[PDB]
Amino acid sequence: MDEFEMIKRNTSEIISEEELREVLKKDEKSAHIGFEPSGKIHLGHYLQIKKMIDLQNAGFDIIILLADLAAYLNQKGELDEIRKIGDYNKKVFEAMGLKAKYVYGSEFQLDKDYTLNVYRLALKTTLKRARRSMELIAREDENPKVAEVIYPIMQVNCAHYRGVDVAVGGMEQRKIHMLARELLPKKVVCIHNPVLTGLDGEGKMSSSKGNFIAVDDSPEEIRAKIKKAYCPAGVVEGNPIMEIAKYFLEYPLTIKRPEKFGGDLTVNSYEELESLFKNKELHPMDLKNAVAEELIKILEPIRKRLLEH
Amino acid sequence: MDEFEMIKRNTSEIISEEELREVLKKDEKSAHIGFEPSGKIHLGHYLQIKKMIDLQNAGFDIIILLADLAAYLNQKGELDEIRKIGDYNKKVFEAMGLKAKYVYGSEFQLDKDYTLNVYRLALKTTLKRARRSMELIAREDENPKVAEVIYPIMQVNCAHYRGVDVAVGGMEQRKIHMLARELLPKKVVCIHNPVLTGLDGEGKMSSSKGNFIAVDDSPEEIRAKIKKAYCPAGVVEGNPIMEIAKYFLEYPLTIKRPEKFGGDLTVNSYEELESLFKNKELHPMDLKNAVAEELIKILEPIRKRLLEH
Ligand SMILES: N[C@@H](Cc1ccc(O)c([N+](=O)[O-])c1)C(=O)O
Ligand SMILES: N[C@@H](Cc1ccc(O)c([N+](=O)[O-])c1)C(=O)O
Ligand SMILES: N[C@@H](Cc1ccc(O)c([N+](=O)[O-])c1)C(=O)O
Ligand SMILES: N[C@@H](Cc1ccc(O)c([N+](=O)[O-])c1)C(=O)O
Ligand code: NA
Ligand code: NA
């Protein structure tokens, strides 16, 4: 498995693979991702940091944008407070093993030249396109604000300004990224990670929807959250427990079961697990028990690093 | 006629008169108006500069904003070119006798603190409200751009930033001004001048609609434009020729007519003229002849100052 395939693994899309293959030849290459600071850092965050670690192992310099000004425009509070939560998020990412450079958006996003470019992009971006780009990002608002349409052109300008080769984010970012690839002279390679389903199966996992596992959740909390989670027998689509098994667990995987239910079961790949589960040969409760215990072990070093502060 | 009434004369509205009366007591008081730079300076501009001269005579320090960055956001071209047209407009205003300070918007509107405040106002302003505020300003665009909704919050921030006591503009600005009075801690007094009708009577006089008299138009050009203008007998509403008589001409006014049509006629006020014209006692052609010749004399010193450059 070469560098390209390592980077591609468990992504939803790469825009475009040919452009990524051209970047991979350079000696010096940079990848960045931005996060609105979040009170809790959850598995959706972790999936993305894992992808940044993969890029780092492929020779990329990693930059983590603590997107304080974007969060401000998206109604997350005052800059002062947002920045404090950003510093906490930095500590969590560091505890995940990421070695990276961290920058706050407002360190450069209020520069005269940055702003001037935002206004030039504003002349090229329709209101309809900007609003469409924000459908999966913008905070719920019955009376959408002008800030909502500044946000995307701010993010477009960010990759242009910083000179990054690769931008990474969840699929919720893909319309902003395709706007950037249309408007900017240098085309940035975009790597989009899948959006995890919330534990109740009803929407996407989100810090604001209370449907997440946080990386520093206690073992008991993780067991309770998974016990209650949506997980229909034979159903993989939209099944948060199967997503966790696909994106976080190490294989071959031994699923412990009582002898009266088949005894311990060893699966060599996620695809094998998927066949077992689809064939109703693996019961949700045993899948849940394995996913909970393996996820606890995966998160343990992160939780422990945060606990010793 | 005191300072308040001099300022009020020929305005459409003052928001509010009580606030203006409080400003008038101060020793130091400032009034400003902004103009997107315009290739031609027309009677609509002149009406407003006349109002700035009235404020100047009432003890106000006058600032003329050459609104280069606003014009840029409203699709009037590149900043470089817009700024050149701004310097020409300054020369025209000076030729009208205005003594004032001139500032380009971009001298301060790209400051970090200015921008930060724009983004704070963006959080408080709905997209619907911003678009409504721009209905009579925004350049025609079948696909409205994000720039269109940045523009008004930029203008709101301008009066707040510069610390002006009074903002002056045409009635087309009134929704932006009422947004500013809602969002800003210090309430700015707003003085709105009437919108002149275009010469063909079909819309408002505009530099982009080719329906204007420019202050530096030749006498022959002024005569031809007025000869062709909408001017129905007995109709005052929407009659550009009667508007010119109301807002630019000095009274008492002697209207020369052939003896076979009544001979020379002297009117002591615009209201007298209005009664004559409504009663079909003054024919459009004689009104036009008088308005053309008196307007030529009014504009003559401006045209001559510009010609001797
Ligand atoms: N849109 C990202 C945050 C973000 C990512 C990348 C960026 O460049 C910026 N930005 O520029 O402000 C912001 C999120 O949903 O969390
Ligand atoms: N359509 C989603 C977009 C969204 C998802 C998750 C979120 O955390 C936020 N948000 O609050 O910024 C917004 C919503 O209902 O809001
Ligand atoms: N809206 C004005 C121009 C303008 C007036 C006042 C202002 O403060 C600003 N501005 O801030 O950019 C711009 C026009 O239609 O010509
Ligand atoms: N509703 C008017 C608003 C407007 C009037 C005059 C103008 O010069 C401009 N303009 O081009 O900026 C715009 C229009 O049809 O455009
Ligand atoms: Na090398
Ligand atoms: Na005094």
Curated annotation (Swiss-Prot), chains A, B:
GO terms for molecular function: ATP binding; tyrosine-tRNA ligase activity. Coiled coil: none annotated. It is an enzyme of class 6 (ligase). Residues 228-231, 283-288 are annotated as: Interaction with t-RNA. It comes from Methanocaldococcus jannaschii (strain ATCC 43067 / DSM 2661 / JAL-1 / JCM 10045 / NBRC 100440). L-tyrosine binds at H32, E36, Q173. The keyword Ribosomal protein does not apply. This is Tyrosine--tRNA ligase.
